[PDB]
Symmetry: D2
Subunit: 422 residues, 4 copies
């Protein structure tokens, strides 16, 4: 029965054609949903009670669209999100961190606009985790956003939105200096022929997967759900194909900001993503990712590949990684393991930001410290295991891969352990 | 010889890639499609697309198959639709550059345990009116297909039966249904209500893959450009859906309300045409052909053996087209199963076969009407040159191009065994 | 039948990985196909008698090597005459006659920089006596090949030049030598003294791989069955060496002292024949054909395009043979480069081409002696029938087998463009 | 190029020109062959073990010291010839020559002693002389038994029973020398520690032109099973009377290594020939060239795909360690082992990195020579009070001996494989360490 669930017959197939033929509608998904859901906050999703429902439905990142609304409006939104998130902090083994992202208005007719500088300053002051920089056309646009974030905003992640021909053509230079990319299909579909957008989406997702950087698929994913309780056949297909393409995050705009079914739209994206993740052809995917990733003398990079290889060999339920900045979890994520990457961190900001990486499940470690570093480490490992058992990721008898470092401080991951649960 | 510009068009850098990841990374929005659109467009005829003038516009936009939905309307209504389609098609019989045959398909109302009384009457209507295809609704088992086949009276055995899979039973009994059907339609509308909406993409991808493996046509249907019923442009999810159905391996893409009752029927056809052309150039032929080749079983049928040699030969020289002489369409279908990048120009004396080959991806029919030559070898040469002259006239061929010619050793269907490499003069 | 798929290592040939392939090798799986790797035997005192030469032709000798490092022109002319007498002693049965090529192995430059004066005299002797191949000793650069070609003059245009790589310079300048040569010989004797003995296997594997990539014949030579000069059976290392040269991709295997001066010249030929047959069945065609196909560049030459379609077609039906009509042998060489499991039966009227095609693996020459038919298509059919009749007589074909026939559209060399699937009657 | 561009800038273009690295990075096997370079020098230590047969030509303690320096890893005693007194003198001479280098335990070279049985002859099973010879082996502390003419699983059970309770640690390598042994191969391999492809008798029992098929099949199955396989007989036959081998002989040795043989053997070449040391030197030189020419890109992928899923932490750690070593071009994998099993599981994935096995067991240190790429280090120090410190001292001993023998340099990356608790069977940790 284990090998009949989560499309395992289709995952073992020798060819991609055999893989497609073996897809079974009766093979149920078992693993936790790996692709993060970004929901846009607006009138339909601003109440603390509504936001609690969206967190339970699966929202991982809350997007504030600075194209509409005042700073007072957005600060109220931020406060409501934080209130709804902290309403579940009572049970630290089941608490879900939610990132806050600021989507800039953009340059419009103009480089970096004066309103954008004021909005970016607002984001730093209000402690946002991510910036979705609108209409990025070159590497110098990213540098301008980075400069506007100042010294207090070094930790904020910059996700460049590609929305026009220039951004697509200069993609490589933008990706090099960005933390990730958003495939902003709305404007892109007006700037380039609508029938060419799928080529740009597939190219940008592929390059981001190659680079190991997060990529978000955005706009009109479940558009009809703004007024209707169920999406169209094209919409469910679109969500599924974005996940199959390799998107780290999927987004909802009007569907959650102004629609009549914001919670239902989140539930739909959650349901589709789970099905699509089980349908991933890991046999060729892991091989291609392995072959494409360059040789490395960075021990974190070397431990990540060894850990993902080890997890595939034993069908590990999870890979528990200790991370400070989230980097060790990101390097595990780039190899697209079938095993969940449970990232145990003390940094609340890192816990929110690792939602950008597919398959990373952040656990904010709030237990009291241990005096001996070795005991402190073991405690954070056992923490990941208890939360994993509570949340359904792990059972007694399961195998896990534990990824740690040799000394405290970020950048020293170099150990991989094969551990049996209880 | 061909130029650097030749190798930058139709996603050729992405097609030459050693891995699927490299292939995705090499996709270029500036790489323009050159080949003719190979995925057929099925448009549903209704109040929005019934007039002879409106139908002429849809043929020019790219409609290859006209679907008559027998869930709505009387026999008198559908016979008027058939007559209007035939009138609009024959309005271009003068100009060989604009004349294209259009298939007529009957979509049944559906069942009850088995074939309904109304369905038997509707199938009899189809035989009497000379329809080419039947889209049999709610097929759940092989005996359902046999019932449709039996209902296609003594005169309708040439009609193609495309079984619509619309429920859990049809998905579970897929293999037995495909074995006895001519092809499949992934009827996503009802399927999305019978099974969880989030599982439909799995059923679509599985059924397309199995149809590609079997060498049988598969249609992706319902809500492809749904918003275009009221809006002139589709959503980002809708264009993505059409593109992904083509990339998945669908032979045909369909329009229902978009053409039958919508405000932009011609614009919806134009949109599907535009997306399909882009998506066909983005197909990863390097791994696709290898997998199709490896998966297809060994064969001692000369048509099947010639088809693989012809597709292999066409890939080797970047052949502008594969010209195949076929009477039933079978030879063109066997070429099509290997998914060549070259156009399959099928020269036939059969008007029905010319209409039905629209079900197979990349098959471009040419109806030949010349009186037969006394020497068979001269009749073959005359039909082969007609394929080249038409090709030249339509933009597929130029002097200096290479084409692969597939013929047989003796007259009559079933003897295809020759593949020739010809230089266009 | 089940028994068919148990012979000639077919389970090992169908394996998904190279590791699975090795694990499936069966010592009880008997070779059925004809031995495709040619045997070159050096003529000397042990193999000069007309009766002895008839035994070597029956044992499997395809090419007779005349070593111009030893003996006078008078000696070599007597050799040539004895070979031709023994070969023509079987010309009474044209359906079973075996052509034998005559190759001249030059003495070399020695201390000189380029072509020696004795080499010029020996090369002109070869042209005067009608030799087919030249094994040019110690080739170090492309200009060495040009010098041999110039010394052959205008009358020696058809002679094939196989460059012997015997030193570090030849290995380093390999690419420029191969570009201008008809093929290569891996002269392991001198090479093993010029470079460290433990590095020779790397040079052999590299040169064979590059020759296979280029589609040019490659010969593995020297000490293959060395112990058989005095002993009736070879060592375990010697049989392994012969088998591995075939598995590496060598078109020809050679015997030097083993046939020229040894006590068991016929037994050495029989041993090489037996090992090569075993090794050819153990070839992993699944990956090999895929790699050859992928590595070969796109082509607008119809012969090149027909060859790949024909090999692809032969694999699809497990064709017993590919019968090709050839004037120069080039059409057979282009089929051979794709390493088909099917025998390439080359029917030719050129006695020289019939002798030279022995350089290409899996090409079985048939010299057709009949005068032309007035109708060219009838002449073409008669030759094809001759191939079928010879192949039936020799055991390559049986009634019911499928065969691929490769012909051209007009008389004369360079016009191959047709591939046909034929059932043996 | 981008998949090796950063590491190329770091390690240099000269690094990537050595040990057939361009040929090893090739996308196809055809490209791999085309890229083989005679100028690309081997850098890695010779990983295929050399088994030399001891006889009149190689019995003296002085001659044996020369053979150990030439590369001999296993000494074979052929019980088809000679008395027990003769073989005991041979064993004593081997041990004397081996211990003459024990002064420096950081550079000492352990040598296994293998007993090759006479065989059943006319009989159906284990002969009476074989029982006496096997008892002799147990009494004299031999490490391996090469059991002649094994034809079924019950033959290896008989050898195991004849070894008695004290010979439980001895490895049984079954010799396949006839059609029955080839046909029942799977049942024999299941119960054996490894196999020897005994080509001499096999070449007389089956057609000589079919032996290469049997060799290639048995090596492939042994590689798939993760068990040692020895290629034997007539490898450098001409070197019995001549100082240089033939072109077929060098080719044969190279092809046995390329086929996947863990060990290569010398029989008459060392036992009775005129050039026993030269034959060992030749096999050493060829094996080093052949190992660099291995197409690791497809090999590792195939080994990985063929090996079944495992819930054994040693098995899981071994594949993660080999994958990690390939990612950074690790100079070595240092593994702590008691029985040699952890080193054997690393070896089955055919890493290009040397597997430096640190052990306290002298028998395990001798027996790991059966596994390709395993370099045994016998640790003689007394245990530390804290187990974690004892472990670290052993790891450091491996790093220091690896630097001393040339395997490691400052700046190199190494993968360290250890367990979480003392005792055999608990390997579960993989560490990436930078050499300082
Ligand atoms: O290796 S993959 O898993 N599969 C990729 C693949 C997709 C198509 C084709 S084909 O040659 O067009 C084809 C062949 C046969 C039948 C056909 O109908 C089509 C081959 C291989 C993967 C790797 C990536 O680098 C990535 O970025 C995403 C994917 C990917 C793509 C689609 C999936 O369904 C999926 O699970 C993963
Ligand atoms: O595709 S091939 O058939 N073989 C290709 C191949 C050979 C080795 C390796 S491996 O990665 O080293 C390896 C993998 C697994 C187990 C192992 O023990 C070894 C993989 C694949 C072929 C192609 C040519 O370009 C050619 O010139 C000759 C051959 C060839 C070589 C050896 C044969 O046994 C054979 O039949 C053919
Ligand atoms: O992903 P990052 O930022 O490199 O953090 C991983 C770090 O986690 C650790 O295992 C634990 O260290 P801390 O005690 O600082 O939490 C480090 O040794 C390692 O460097
Ligand atoms: O695709 P189909 O129905 O098998 O038709 C292919 C047939 O067409 C031909 O090429 C031409 O034959 P006709 O003259 O009868 O049209 C035959 O030789 C071949 O058998
Ligand atoms: O292999 P080559 O030398 O190119 O010769 C192939 C030629 O042989 C033929 O099949 C038969 O021609 P001939 O009648 O001149 O022998 C030609 O059609 C073709 O051009
Ligand atoms: O390879 P083996 O025989 O399983 O031994 C590996 C064992 O060696 C160790 O690394 C060290 O253990 P010891 O203290 O017994 O020498 C263990 O942690 C591990 O279980
Ligand atoms: O801004 C966006 O997200 C877009 O344009 O799609
Ligand atoms: O009938 C159809 O096409 C459907 O239900 O999707
Ligand atoms: O000339 C040769 O053939 C040689 O030197 O081996
Ligand atoms: O016994 C042996 O070693 C043989 O037969 O080769
Ligand atoms: K915005
Ligand atoms: K209907
Ligand atoms: K010579
Ligand atoms: K013995
Ligand atoms: Mg926008
Ligand atoms: Mg329906
Ligand atoms: Mg020489
Ligand atoms: Mg023996």
């Amino acid at each position: 029965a284990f090998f009949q669930q989560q499309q395992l017959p289709a995952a073992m197939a020798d060819t991609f054609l055999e893989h497609l033929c073996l897809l079974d509608i009766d093979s149920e998904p078992v693993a936790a949903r790996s692709t993060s859901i970004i929901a846009t906050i607006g009138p339909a999703s601003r109440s603390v009670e509504r936001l609690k429902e969206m967190i339970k439905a699966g929202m991982n990142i809350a997007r504030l669209n600075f194209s509409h609304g005042s700073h007072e409006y957005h600060a109220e939104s931020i406060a409501n999100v934080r209130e709804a998130v902290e309403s579940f902090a009572g049970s630290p083994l089941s608490y879900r961190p939610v990132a806050i992202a600021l989507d800039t208005k953009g340059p419009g007719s103009g480089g970096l606009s004066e309103q954008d500088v004021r909005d970016l300053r607002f984001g730093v002051e209000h402690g946002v985790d991510i910036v979705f920089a609108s209409f990025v056309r070159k590497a110098s646009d990213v540098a301008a956003v980075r400069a506007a974030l100042g010294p207090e905003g070094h930790g904020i992640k910059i996700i460049s939105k590609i929305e026009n021909h220039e951004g697509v053509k200069r993609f490589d230079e933008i990706l090099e200096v960005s933390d990730g990319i958003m495939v902003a299909r709305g404007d892109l579909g007006i700037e380039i022929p609508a029938e060419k957008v799928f080529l740009a989406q597939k190219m940008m997702i592929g390059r981001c997967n190659l680079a190991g950087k997060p990529v978000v698929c955005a706009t009109q994913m479940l558009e009809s759900m703004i007024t209707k309780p169920r999406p169209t056949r094209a919409e469910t297909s679109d969500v599924a194909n974005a996940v199959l393409d390799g998107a780290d995050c999927i987004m909802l705009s009007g569907e959650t900001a102004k629609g009549n079914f914001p919670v239902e739209a989140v539930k739909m994206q959650h349901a589709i993503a789970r099905e699509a993740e089980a349908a991933v052809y890991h046999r060729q995917l892991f091989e291609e990712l392995r072959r494409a990733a360059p040789l490395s003398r960075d021990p974190t990079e070397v431990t990540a590949i060894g850990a993902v290889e080890a997890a595939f060999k034993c069908c590990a339920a999870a890979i528990i990684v200790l991370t400070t900045t989230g980097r060790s979890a990101q390097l595990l994520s780039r190899y697209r393991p079938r095993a969940a990457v449970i990232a145990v961190t003390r940094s609340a900001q890192a816990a929110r930001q690792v939602h950008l990486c597919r398959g990373v499940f952040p656990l904010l470690y709030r237990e009291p410290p241990e005096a001996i570093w070795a005991d402190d480490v073991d405690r954070r490992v056992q923490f990941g295991i208890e939360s994993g058992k509570l949340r359904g990721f792990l059972r007694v008898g399961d195998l896990v891969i534990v990824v740690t470092g040799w000394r405290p401080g970020s950048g020293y991951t170099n150990i991989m352990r094969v551990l049996s649960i209880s």
